[PDB]
Design a protein around this nucleic acid. Sequence first.
DNA 1: TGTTGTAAACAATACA
DNA 2: ATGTATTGTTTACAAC
Lengths: 98, 95
Amino acid sequence: DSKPPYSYAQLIVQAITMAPDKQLTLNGIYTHITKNYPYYRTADKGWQNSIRHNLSLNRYFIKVPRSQEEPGKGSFWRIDPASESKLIEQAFRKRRPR
Amino acid sequence: DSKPPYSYAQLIVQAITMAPDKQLTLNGIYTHITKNYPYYRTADKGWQNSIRHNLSLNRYFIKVPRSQEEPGKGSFWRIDPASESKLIEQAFRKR
DNA sequence: TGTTGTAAACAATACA
DNA sequence: ATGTATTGTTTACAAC
Ligand SMILES: [Mg+2]
Ligand SMILES: [Mg+2]
């Protein structure tokens, strides 16, 4: 299993919208990607740093506080509705080999 | 009065190097910092979590198992031998 | 030029 | 109160 032809943001977007209510925890994001693209092993922290970096930089990823009744670590991440259609449209557009 | 121009790793190097056996317990590290740099008050625990985090993170600081000089307050912390000299020279390099 | 990949510095927060 | 792991923000620079 090799490195998929997608950017980290595209992968985040793939994972986020593939979730029941379209929102995930950082953890959830790592799980989705590692499950559907084994290349990214949960033991390599490299790409994970990359995921976090993309969540913060890219302005279209919004953080959602955990309900007070379910106090876990880290919040929920979801696509900004404003650009959801844009991001989702190209989330699966494979890119030319890097 | 004002936040010193040093990282937490630097303050720690400062504090340990300053102790006699050249080693300190977290508590000792805290007290050294707020005594020399009043800005850090034992009231704001923000920087204190930082100190504990920096101790665990940095492969620069080694944890020494404590015997019984205190059956109620953690281990001792001293600087990595191979890098001690480098750190000492950098401990006060304002950044 | 504008975008994406990596690495890392540096904290905040959760929690064992 | 001690100590460690995760989660998040932000820079700097390389690769595309
Ligand atoms: Mg964001
Ligand atoms: Mg350590």
